[PDB]
């Protein structure tokens, strides 16, 4: 049985990739030295593949993004960049003020760079897949170039600001594109390349028959090449149509869904091609029963096997993770150990009761009114307004404030244990007190504690929740040179003790103005983490939801009038197929309402970072919040159209009027344009004024003046609509 593997992490066991990248950018090392560091990573990867699988991928060490590489390869370099000079122009397209837009790669935590097609004509600008081939060739190693298929490349790109996803939009462009590919392939085939790994994950989106008619012709023109196509993240939209493509080797993801299998054993698989069962999950870190897996591969008479989806979604290795909770490590498996499981499967082909809180589990299993707030919005509204006494067009912020390097250095010392709880506790309060006075002096109406004690919105909570563990070196690539260690939800989730009361209560005792409670939603917490697969995702979300609700009662009991639940993954966690959204939102909505099941007089705020709400608004309407903050600066308020077009919308809206990803200071005229836009249809008493999002990434010198304008804006605004 032929064993395949792809997506093995490119970062290195010590994140040497990130270091080489940052050393080159800062000027600490030359391109030659950079390349040397790179070539070493290449050997590190091929070495791991060789020891476990039969097919060793090639062209996988992207210096920033593989979609970007695909774009450079076909000549898609925006005119603003001039002539492609090399890494220099390559990094200009990846980072900095002229860079391509970045965004999430399908439903994962990896971000790619969006190509911008400015001409209908593509051409072979650079054959990176051949370069890399001859490279592992010189070193005496045979590799199968790893490329992103032509259909997917276009589907992940834009033209004149719009995704290129309708069949009429792609048709013309594709013809000119496959020309570059065929050209690339022939060259590979000439130099002896015996196999090419083509990636078409876009085959799993909700495609029209017309898409397939188009895809079919794409692959007819490339039929003379030794292509092996892979699909993952969900089931392919048209099974029968997919198994008809002019390809001899076809990969399927049998882990992330039940449709591929069901389809394959209801309509069968063609005898003119070979199946490569993707049976090892590349998105979860759990050790699996290679038994029941061998049974699958056997019953399906699959000729090959491989991981379901890329392995770059997992950490490099579990080897040194020896500080994990009791028994956890024994059940884990990261990238390298996934490669080892494949080998064990090949060779053979030739733990549920863990961490459980039955009272918690049962608690979840058992009233209905725990998902519904005792009163309807219109009633809660009256009370809250009376309690709050806020002015018309009340101003507030999203939560975090810039971080002094001292703030950063100190929070790390507490983790490392260098200082004591008391000493860190004292430091944070001085940071909070300083923040509260500044905000009061600026003129804000509703204040926040600054989140100086939090590394990030998910990690902070993972370390305080039972059933969730964090790793030491489990670093995963997000984009460019930035990595993140995703927590691991290994058991039933419960909160042992209050997690935020000390800072929130303290912050509030220093002011007569309302100080927001600051929580992260249940979906977002699991969206950024790995979690158990042996239980419905809905259950894990409910467990975390209960944990957060318990925290909400504490804040209320303590006298906090406003509580904010950040739920930016509400939409991001959503299935890739919009057709599978119904089921998903059902439990995602319940999880949020369960977490925000507060008393009538507690004003709940929901914060979301989405650039557009037209496709989920019917789902948002169902969340029992009292106000929802949104990022309206980029659209200059136009993002409000989904709200003003929603019949019967009556909830408050935190209009983001400032783009916190740019260090610039939004002028008053600037912020007004947006507010004015939002006041076109919606009642003035529904509007709040705030920044697009949190300020943890900005600097105080840019924040103070921007905040002053924002307060100055609301002042003027109140004078008008007096
Ligand atoms: N409370 C967080 C929200 C991030 S979406 C912040 O203000 O940074
Ligand atoms: O249908 C999937 C699309 O919306 C993007 O997530 C692909 O990256
Ligand atoms: Zn945000």
618 C-alpha to ligand 1 centroid (Å) = 24
Q: How far apart are CA 9 and CA 531, in angstroms?
A: 20
Distance in angstroms (rounded) separating the CA atoms of residues 167 and 162? 13
Cβ < 5 A residues, ion ligand 3: 609, 693
How many angstroms separate the CA atoms of 302 and 275, rounded?
A: 5
Helix (H) or strand (E) holding 524: helix 522-527
Residue closest by Cα to atom 7 of ligand 2: 106
Residue with tokens 């904010």: 564
Distances (CA, A) of 685 to 536, 652, 688, 699: 41, 8, 8, 32
| Closest-lying ligand 1 atom to the alpha carbon of residue 448 | 7
C-alpha pair distances (Å), 187 with each of 193, 217, 225: 9, 21, 11
Query: How many Å lie between the centroid of ligand 1 and the Cα of residue 80?
Result: 33
Instruction: Give the Cα separation of 176 and 170 in Å (integer).
Output: 10
CA Rg value for the chain: 27
CA atoms within 13 A on the CB side of 258: 1
Question: What are φ and ψ of residue 332, in 5° steps?
Answer: -90, 175
Q: What are the residue numbers of the active site?
A: 661
3-state secondary structure of 233: coil
CA 621–ligand 1 middle distance (angstroms): 21
Atom of ligand 2 nearest to the CA of 206: 1
Pocket residue to mutate for ligand 2, from 65, 107, 113, most atoms within 8 A of Cβ: 107
Closest ligand by atom to 581 CA: 2
Give the CA count within 13 Å in the CB-facing half-sphere of 715: 10
- Residue 456 Cα to ligand 1 middle (Å): 9
Strands (E), 71-202: 102-104, 111-113, 144-148, 158-159, 162-163, 196-199
Cross-sheet strand order for the sheet of 196-199: 2-3, 304-307, 274-280, 249-253, 227-230, 196-199, 144-148, 57-58
Atom of ligand 2 nearest to the CA of 205: 1
Please give the backbone phi and psi of residue 667, each rounded to the nearest 5 degrees, phi first. -70, 160
Identify any residues that bridge with 530 across adjacent strands, giving them in sequence order. 488
Q: Return the closest-CA partner of residue 571 out of 537, 542, 611, 533.
A: 611
Residue 614 to residue 384: CA distance in whole angstroms: 29
Please tell me the number of the ligand nearest to residue 401's CA.
Answer: 1
In terms of Cα–Cα distance, which of 698, 701, 706, 703 is closest to 666?
706
How many CB atoms neighbour CB 435 within 10 A?
A: 20
Classified as helix, coil or strand, 683 is coil
Phi, psi dihedral angles at 124 (to 5 degrees)? -70, 95
106 in contact with ligand 2, CB cutoff 6 A: yes
Cα-based torsion angle of the residue sequence 334, 338, 340, 341 in order, rounded to the nearest 10 degrees: 130
The answer to whether the beta carbons of residues 237 and 194 sit under 8 Å apart is no
Q: Do domains 1-353+472-486 and 354-471+487-722 have the same CATH topology?
A: yes
Percentages of the chain per state (helix, strand, coil), in multiples of 5: 45, 15, 45
Enumerate residues 6+ apart whose C-beta is below 8 A from 4: 53, 54, 55, 197, 228, 251, 276, 304, 305, 306, 307, 342
Ligand 2 pocket, residue 110 CB under 6 Å? no
Site residues for ligand 1, CB cut-off 6 Å: 398-400, 457, 518, 566, 568, 607, 609, 693-694, 696
User: Are the C-beta atoms of 260 and 235 separated by less than 8 Å?
Assistant: yes
Q: For residue 478, what are the CA distances in angstroms to 12, 96, 221, 483, 558?
A: 14, 17, 35, 5, 38
- Short-list 511, 508, 593, 519, CA closest to 552: 519
CA distances from 642 to 18, 112, 161, 296, 629 (A): 40, 27, 20, 46, 14
d(CA 405, CA 425): 17
For the annotated binding site, the residues are: 15-18, 104, 398-400, 451, 482-483, 528, 566, 572, 607, 609, 631, 693
Report how far ligand 2's centroid is from the alpha carbon of 470 (Å).
Answer: 29
Q: Which residue out of 694, 695, 696 has the highest number of ligand 1 atoms within 8 Å of its CB and is therefore the one to mutate? A: 694
For residue 619, report the distance from its CA to the centre of ligand 2, in Å: 19
| SS3 at position 284 | coil
- Residue 192's Cβ-count burial label (10 Å; 0-12, 13-18, 19+) is exposed
Q: In terms of residues, how long is the chain?
A: 722
Instruction: Point out the ligand 2 atom lying closest to the alpha carbon of residue 577.
Output: 1
User: What are the extents of the domains in the chain?
Assistant: 1-353+472-486, 354-471+487-722
Binding site as annotated, residues for L-methionine: 398-400, 451, 566
Task: Give nearest CA residue, ligand 1 atom 1.
Answer: 399
Please name the residue whose Cα sits nearest to atom 8 of ligand 2.
106
Residues 334 and 313: their CA atoms lie apart, in Å, by 9
CB 461 within 8 A of CB 520: yes
Q: Which ligand is nearest to the CA of 615?
A: 2
Please say whether the beta carbons of 72 and 143 come within 8 A: no
For the Cβ of 105 lying below 6 angstroms from any atom of ligand 2, the answer is yes
Calpha distance 533→462 (Å, rounded): 18
Compute the distance from residue 268 Cα to the ligand 2 centre, in Å.
28
Q: In the block, which residue shows the tokens 């090639």?
A: 58
Tokens of 163: 């995704």
3-class DSSP state of 639: helix
Are 309 and 283 contacting, i.e. CB atoms less than 8 angstroms apart? yes
432 secondary structure, DSSP code:
H
**Which residues are CB-contacts of 240 (< 8 A; sequence separation ≥ 6)?**
267
Q: Is the CB of 233 under 6 A from ligand 2?
A: no
Q: Contact at 8 Å (CB) between 605 and 565? A: yes
Give the residue, out of 111, 155, 313, with the most ligand 2 atoms within 8 A of its beta carbon, to mutate for a pocket test: 155
Residues belonging to the binding site for 5-methyltetrahydropteroyltri-L-glutamate are 15-18, 104, 482-483, 528, 572
Nearest CA among 170, 151, 149 for reference residue 229: 149
Backbone angles phi, psi at 285, to 5 degrees: -100, 25
CA dihedral 304, 309, 311, 313 (to 10 degrees): -170
Please state, in angstroms and rounded to a whole number, the distance separating the CA atoms of residues 265 and 301: 11
The CATH number that domain 354-471+487-722 falls under is 3.20.20.210
CA 297 to centroid of ligand 2, rounded, Å: 29
Handedness of CA 43, 71, 129, 51 (dihedral sign): positive
**Which residues are CB-neighbours of 386 under 8 A, at least 6 positions away?**
none
Contact 357, 406 (CB under 8 A): no
Positive or negative, the CA dihedral 207, 208, 210, 213 is: positive
Residue with CA at minimum distance from ligand 1 atom 4: 694
> Are the C-beta atoms of residues 401 and 706 closer than 8 Å to each other?
no
- Residue 108 CA, chain-centre distance (Å), reads 5
The CA distances from residue 421 to 88, 400, 428, in Å, are 46, 21, 10
CATH number for the region 1-353+472-486 comes to: 3.20.20.210
Looking from the CA of 90 toward its CB, the CA atoms found within 13 Å total: 21
Ligand 2 site, residue 205, Cβ cutoff 6 A: yes
Centroid of chain to Cα 476: 12
Experimental method reported for this structure: X-ray
Torsion angle (degrees, nearest 10) of CA 712, 713, 715, 721: 170
| Residue 227 zone, left/alpha/beta (φ > 0; ψ -120 to 50; rest) | beta
For residue 146, the cross-strand partners are 197
């Amino acid at each position: 049985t032929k064993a395949y593997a792809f997506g093995f992490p490119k970062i290195g066991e010590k994140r040497e990739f990130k270091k080489a990248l940052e050393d080159f950018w800062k000027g600490k090392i030359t391109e030659e030295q950079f390349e040397e560091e790179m070539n070493k990573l290449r050997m590190y990867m091929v070495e791991n593949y060789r020891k476990n699988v039969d097919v060793i991928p090639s062209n996988e060490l992207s210096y920033y993004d593989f979609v970007l590489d695909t774009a450079v390869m076909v000549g898609a370099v925006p005119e603003r960049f001039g002539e492609y000079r090399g890494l220099s122009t390559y990094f200009d397209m990846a980072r900095g003020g002229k860079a391509l837009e970045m965004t999430k790669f399908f439903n994962t935590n990896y971000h790619y760079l969006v190509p911008e097609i400015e001409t209908e004509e593509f051409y072979l600008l650079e054959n990176k897949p051949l370069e890399d081939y001859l490279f592992f060739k010189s070193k005496g190693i045979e590799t199968a170039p790893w490329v992103i298929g032509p259909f997917t490349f276009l589907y992940l790109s834009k033209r004149n600001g719009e995704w290129i996803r309708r069949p009429n939009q792609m048709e013309k462009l594709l013809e000119s594109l496959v020309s570059v590919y065929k050209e690339v392939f022939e060259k590979l085939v000439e130099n002896g390349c015996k196999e090419i790994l083509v990636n078409e994950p876009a085959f799993v989106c909700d495609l029209e028959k017309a898409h397939w008619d188009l895809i079919l012709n794409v692959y007819r023109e490339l039929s003379e090449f030794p292509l092996t196509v892979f699909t993952y993240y969900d089931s392919v939209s048209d099974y029968e149509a997919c198994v008809s493509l002019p390809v001899k080797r076809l990969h399927f993801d049998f882990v992330s869904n039940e449709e591929n299998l069901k389809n394959l054993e209801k309509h069968g698989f063609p005898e003119d091609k070979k199946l490569v069962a993707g049976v090892i999950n590349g998105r979860q870190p759990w050790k699996v029963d290679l038994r029941k897996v061998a049974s699958l591969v056997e019953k399906l008479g699959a000729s090959a096997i491989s991981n379901s989806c890329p392995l770059f979604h997992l950490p490099v290795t579990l080897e040194l993770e020896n500080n994990l909770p009791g028994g956890l490590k024994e059940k884990l498996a990261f990238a390298k150990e996934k490669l080892e499981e494949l080998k064990m499967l090949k060779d053979f082909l030739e733990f549920e009761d863990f961490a459980v809180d039955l009272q918690a589990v049962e608690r979840v299993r058992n009233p209905e009114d725990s998902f519904r707030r005792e009163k309807e919005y219109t009633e809660r509204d009256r009370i809250q307004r009376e309690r709050l006494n806020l002015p018309l067009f009340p101003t507030t912020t999203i939560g975090s404030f810039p971080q002094t390097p001292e703030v950063r250095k100190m929070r790390s010392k507490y983790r490392k244990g260098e200082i004591s709880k008391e000493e860190y506790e004292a430091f944070i309060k001085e940071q909070i007190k300083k923040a509260i006075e500044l905000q009061e002096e600026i003129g804000l109406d509703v204040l926040v504690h600054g989140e100086f004690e939090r590394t990030d919105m998910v990690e902070f909570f993972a370390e305080k929740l039972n059933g969730i563990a964090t790793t030491q070196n489990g670093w995963v690539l997000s984009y460019g040179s930035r990595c993140y260690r995703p927590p691991i939800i290994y058991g039933t989730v419960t909160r042992p003790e209050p997690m935020t009361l000390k800072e929130i209560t303290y912050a509030q005792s220093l002011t007569e103005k309302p100080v927001k409670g600051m929580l992260t939603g249940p979906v977002t917490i699991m969206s950024w983490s790995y979690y158990r697969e042996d239980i419905p995702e809905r259950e894990i979300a409910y467990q975390i939801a209960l944990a957060i609700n318990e925290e909400v009662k504490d804040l209320e009991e303590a006298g906090i009038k406003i509580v904010q639940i950040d739920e930016p993954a509400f939409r991001e966690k959503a299935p890739i197929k919009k057709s599978k959204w119904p089921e998903y939102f059902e439990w995602a909505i319940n999880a949020f309402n369960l977490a925000a099941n507060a008393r009538p007089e507690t004003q709940i705020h929901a914060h979301m970072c989405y650039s557009d709400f037209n496709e989920i608004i019917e789902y948002i309407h169902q969340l029992e919040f009292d106000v929802i903050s949104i990022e309206a600066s980029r659209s200059k308020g136009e993002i409000i159209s989904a709200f003003e077009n929603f019949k019967g919308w009556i909830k408050q809206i935190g209009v983001g009027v400032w783009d916190i990803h740019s260090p610039a200071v939004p002028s008053i005229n600037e912020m007004r344009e947006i507010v004015e836009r939002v006041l076109r249809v919606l009642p003035k008493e529904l509007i709040w004024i705030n920044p697009d999002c949190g300020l943890k990434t900005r600097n105080w010198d840019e924040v103070i003046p921007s905040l002053r304008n924002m307060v100055a804006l609301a002042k003027e605004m109140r004078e008008k609509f007096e």
